[model samples]
Target: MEMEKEFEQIDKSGSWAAIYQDIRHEASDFPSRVAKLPKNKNRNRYRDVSPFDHSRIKLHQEDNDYINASLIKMEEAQRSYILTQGPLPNTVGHFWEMVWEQKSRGVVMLNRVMEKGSLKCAQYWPQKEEKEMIFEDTNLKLTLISEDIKSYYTVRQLELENLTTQETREILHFHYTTWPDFGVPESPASFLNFLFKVRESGSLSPEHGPVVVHCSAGIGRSGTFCLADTCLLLMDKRKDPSSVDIKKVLLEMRKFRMGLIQTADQLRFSYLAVIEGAKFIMGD
Candidate 1:
């Protein structure tokens, strides 16, 4: 319920202005800080300690802290060189890849937070020559094995001339859920299950860490999944427990890692992914 209750901070019509006004005694202070546009435009050059006894933890503080923490982990994951390869990319030169460091959240979490957390993950508009010589060879495969006809044949170890002519030495893994016990679809318990499992998995559990996660733009799927996982973990630490709000949680997430899923399809689908993830961890 605390998790759900926290969502009250960022409900669609929740009026952060009002919340800010209530907290800071100034309407302008609220929007300029929390809902400002062009994310880069707002410099968090200010800090206001809570003036009143916080009956509930302020959403902005909690969400911002969570986002900052998640970004740290995301960057750590990137620097670790764990990301494998995925199916394909939006462009011939670009490819998708992700490594699982933990499995507390679902696809939506990663879709919004993990992928975009590091713009370094992808390079734009790779030329044909570069694609063939560098991009393809260095970053084409997500997993260790490729089974699909296109995937298996398209990727090749060009240097190893003797290898199967055009065998896809690369692997692409998709649609597999990690942990199942944290929670169930549409249930808080399921959400918790996601959080606990990732904490237990250690740094990128292969059992939980994705050997590979492939998809279009990869960021949406990848970021959202990681974000959801982070949310589950944060929710677990809530003091109230009676008011966890997924929508509000996601809104704050986007602020920390810009351009999280913007469509209804993505926002709603996270629930299912959360559910599926719970079932996996729970072993049900």
Candidate 2:
């Protein structure tokens, strides 16, 4: 408690390196038994980055029931997010099944399928003219209804159905196509621009389930987006900017998922974006 008090004063004074290393040490050790199982080895994009066992999401009615996804709930802001890895070819059905089972209204994708000629994520969604996809394992179908392609991002509207029940719901796919694989976005303005674009759909509202947030490994870029958005929302609710502890926030989030905000660079970007957004929404 005393150490954290001292940390707050120093971190608030802009010691990013100090705060970054400190938070990394705070929540770096947690268990992830499911991710290390024999059958679940291929379920994760990266070998080391795994969801904590206590808070990981479980699939219904499946024997394996393993997916590298965790639910990060910000109790202060009353916002929750399902942070996960980019789907593998075999887990595409499981990914959509998680979305449908959770009753999520949006899927926030932060990485491209291919980066620097290496495959990052599977081609999980229908393309421009592709009509529909039927996942035989889950008995779930996805129909691409429409899409709006902007300069740096693409927004697609999809119809998800439980084929057995003949029921359907509209889900939005928010794809930020240009975020670099190693660094943050080109600018916080562009990042927030895409963020608000997602918020505009009311997909993140309490009326629906948590939005599925993912990048290549589900920690680095995905953590940056969730951190910025969570900070912004907490700031709005608290009414005191000082009450929002950014480093502590990330540490708390790390309890659910491991290896969030991979580099100090990404941590700084989350701060920059939050400040840029706070200046406009609240105050500097």
Candidate 3:
């Protein structure tokens, strides 16, 4: 909400070209300061995966005080998101630590546990029937309460507890299972349905710290979800579907996490989803 807006009057069907150009220019201008942080040098699991220093989320409570996570806040819409990479096997504990420290109510996972013959994300929670799992690294435990399976996604109820303090909180896990890496969803309708279900739980509200969003590198599909959600919220707030500048919003989002909405296809899909979502917001 508190972002720069540089709207352009482009054809309804042809504006994507202008939008893409703007994205390219903005990306080229983005500062290369992510690698300069000393903590990031110690924290980033992959050389390619690092948060921009300007917006990287700082763990004030942790001893190391670093994680490859960024907090994107849309103050006008009262929305905040913690975008981070899929937890490495070694960083699973750090991932959970962020969840607890941030007081997040949910984690919106956009990638499968395994994809394309590789492990995309660690099995961060208990199996459907296993009910409980403990993380020795962080002295935390995750207990499953319930799980709802669907065609393209799954909703899981989990209880997260700190072993040291014995404090627990319920966390909703919204896992979109069908999104392919670097590809768009089959249809925006299904994706919107899944998004609204998460919204129904009120986990994305400002009252919470920030909903944790991740998918592998955390800037592709993760970025798409946040971009679409933010645009829709802005549309709802302005009471005008056309008030949003998709490209500008994304540029602002990337300030928090590098390479958000990666690829031309991902960027195109973001506009499509935002346009489709506007219909729902406009009561069409």
Candidate 4:
């Protein structure tokens, strides 16, 4: 069908090289209040990578109402993502507060707490004997109920509770452990394996608040994951999967957050993932 032919043309023509250029053409010149606010300065994991003012997620009920998270929606694809940076030490409470207030069913973490010798995230969740994380500022508490560990990733059942009300809710934490700090996964099959697991949980559905997705800066790895997943969803809905434009989808995603798909190789990986994933959706 047209799906097979479109992929064949992309594979034969090597059009991803050109597609990468189209994404890079729109570079960083967008405005964000993240730049000027001294109060929210320390909340950002990276000074330069922040959400646009209009699309940024604000903490509900908080006076400052700032967190480096963006709410990204792709209408035709029917995808919504709460994309944000890995939490900083001080903003961990705000991070949990956002998840709670937004009612997100799960969190898609694409980086390890440390990569090589550097710290990639703020160690937001529990580690070792520390079975709990207490965020006084937001009056929230996290308790690790159980963990299912795998070689490449780990799934943990975490309980988030309101300190004031003592009300509690369960949340899934999908952590992809092996991905590099600034690169793609080892292969698309491996990445899809993890993605489908999350899909099986039904946390990415519109019924829930957007699945909270992040890495260090919340752009590169997070973006690549969201793009691949969204395109495959687009493919599944269309009679001809070829109608979905990968570059154009990424552009629309970038409108919500800056510096998505950080490198040319990440861009290439996304195309590979979408093309590889479409086969399963199309039953080829």
Candidate 5:
């Protein structure tokens, strides 16, 4: 009976058999990447500059503001970025191996990953132990749990009293990279409180920190998360939200930082991530 229940959940849990039919309920044919803009137009700040390191940018937080910081390849000496890239990595192991190889050589590696839930075991290299607060199961949270295998990572979970989709989307827009794996389903309350635990932890100091993220190839999920979060930090001085051409943002991010949002799925995720950002802003 327990096994049957598990299988039943899997069947209803956005399985391949049902996803196509359901996703159409939300998926749009609209430009998933970004609208085309002038060569130097999309750079939101730093005078529309690409490849600026948010980690290097200092923070001045407001009261009760928990700063969420991300480290991209461009700023770190240990990471490297690749362009146009190669074949989509066929497996999670391949992607992990690539990351290990790059890390070993002191280079930053980039790739595209699907949304968190879209990927299953076949798509990722699992960590030995698990530490996740299950709201309902989703590939997004699972991926985060797996990344926490290393001691350096830490996850923090929170529950918002009430959050709007627009607010969620806005937050996501700012932190869009997280889209591929996570989703925004309407809440009836009683959801498990959850968020990602970093792969490494160091008191949020720029000098040292690590967060592991992936989508199959690690491009979409990882890149978008890195970009949107970094962009938020870049726009720190402003008291208003900003817009950016997604493709240009990714491309520019890659030139110096390489692989900021290296894949189509990741780009989509970045846009989706804005919703979460919105909710975050509203204190929901």
Candidate 6:
């Protein structure tokens, strides 16, 4: 199969420079559309972080109503995800607002609160020492029920409560703590383990709203994680190990969120992880 042949070559050379260059060229032609999205103008921490107008996620009740979030729906595979940036201090309330409005069951955080002595993401959840953390801006409170500390990742059982309605629901926080920014994981084995742990929780199911996936900018690491998971799911759906065209899969996903799979290395890593994951899925 063409797909199999492509993967074999990629495995041999460990380079996808040409494909990455093509993707970059195609992405350069994408419309900024930032002029129409006045809400995103101020919401984005960096000017380059604007969401694509077509698929950008909108908040219902907030005055701004615009968040740096995109709803990525892969109907063929029956998978949906909200790809968004890490919450800034001002955007933390907006982040929780999105989760509440979207009715998401869990949040897959791929970056740590602090990385390289810098704040990569805001401490959006309640800390272990604290019973609960309140977002006064949004009238939301997050209570930490329990924490399962693993070697590379940590799973937290949290309760998100709405102050206005006096209602609360359980939400899971799956944090991949050690993944360096703009870099691949140490191995596909550990990454797949974390991915499966999220899957086992049924957070990725169609029954749930959508699993919120994010890193610092919500592009590089976030895109890699989503692409890998989507490709693996597509393989299972097709029941053919060599059925996925990784580049095409990524192009389709990028239509939902701009600059997904950020670097050539990140794009390369997605294929490597997908290949390794396929073996486990096939019971090899």
Highest lDDT among the candidates is held by which one? Answer: 2
How do the predictions measure up, each by TM-score? 0.34, 0.92, 0.87, 0.91, 0.33, 0.92
Task: Put the candidates in lDDT order, highest first.
Answer: 2, 4, 6, 3, 1, 5
Residue 172 deviation, candidate 6, in Å?
0.2
In the range 1-284, model 6's lDDT, one tens digit per residue, is 54657867866886688879898777633455752476556567667766777788888873667788888999788899999999888889889988998999999999878887889778888887476788887899888999999998999999988999999989999998878654677677888899999999999998889999999899888998889998888888885657688888888888888888778878777877987888887777
> How does model 1 fare in lDDT?
0.32
Candidate 3 regions off by >4 Å? 1-21, 28-45, 60-62, 128-131
**lDDT (10s digit) by residue, model 1, range 66-157:** 11111213331231111212222232222221221132111222221123244322232122323333345224322222222231112211
For each predicted model, how many residue pairs clash, with residues at least 3 apart or on different chains? Answer: 66, 0, 0, 0, 58, 0
Candidate 2 matches the true fold with a TM-score of 0.92
Per residue, candidate 2 scores C-alpha lDDT tens digits across 236-259 of 887466678787888888878888
Indicate whether candidate 1 or candidate 2 has the larger lDDT: 2
User: Model 2, residue 160: displacement in angstroms?
Assistant: 0.8
User: Which consecutive 10 residues in model 1 have the weakest lDDT in total?
Assistant: 49-58
Relative to the true structure, how large is the alpha-carbon lDDT of every model?
0.32, 0.85, 0.79, 0.85, 0.30, 0.84
RMSD, every candidate, angstroms: 13.9, 3.3, 3.9, 2.4, 18.9, 2.1
lDDT string, candidate 3, 31-147, tens digits: 436455675564565687677677777665546666788889887777889999888777788888889989999999998888888887788888865757888977899888999
Q: RMSD (Cα, Å) of candidate 3?
A: 3.9
Across 1-284, the per-residue lDDT of candidate 5 in tens digits comes to 22223334645673534532333333222221111234323212122112223322122223211111123454522332321122122322222332222222111122223333442223232233353222121112222221221222223221111111211100010011222134422330111111221212222234422333333333343455455555434333335445333334455454433234433333444544543444443355
Error of 2 at 226 (Å): 1.0
